[PDB]
Symmetry: C2
Subunit: 106 residues, 2 copies
């Protein structure tokens, strides 16, 4: 059956937003297919602000996360395969979850 | 902040339905406020079919689960406080999750 990760991710995103937290996503920028600004990658990882105000056309689908965001005032489109989403947490207090490894992703 | 249980429950419910599974909910019938047919309770626990075909007016809110269902052809309304939802799983293969204890519920 399908991976649980995208469902847990959307569920946690909603919990975070409903509690007034800013949703931060930790991404493995080395994962095949990840398309993000390389200059912001630190040790092969990048943390992205997924709040409504900081993103444009946010999509949290089963296979990927996609949206527009500004980096130094320049709007850019990011594409993150679901297998590259490692965890999601509140910027304010670190509460959230790290997704469990799922065979289909590796 | 608010309990994560109702969000994980709705997320797992959707994953189950999307994978063609029949969502079964394990409930602690001894929990205060639970309103279910006592004659179906086994050892203080009751398992309920939450599929769309088997329920009427299904509500999965943050504080409770409510819906109409037939027992021996007689329609009855069930009310389950979220603190009484112990786990949710697929009737077909048992895949699902048991919710973690959360202080606010006990
Ligand atoms: Mg926006
Ligand atoms: Mg129905």
């Amino acid at each position: 059956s399908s991976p649980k990760r995208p469902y847990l991710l959307r569920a946690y995103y909603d919990w975070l937003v409903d509690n007034s937290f800013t949703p931060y996503l930790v991404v493995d920028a080395t994962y095949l297919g990840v398309n993000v600004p390389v200059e912001y990658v630190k040790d092969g990882q990048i943390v992205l602000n997924l709040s409504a105000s900081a993103t444009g056309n946010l999509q949290l689908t089963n296979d990927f996360i996609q949206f527009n965001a500004r980096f130094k005032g320049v709007s850019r489109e990011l594409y993150i395969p679901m297998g590259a989403a490692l965890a999601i947490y509140a910027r304010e207090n670190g509460d959230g979850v790290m997704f469990e490894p799922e065979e289909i992703y590796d």
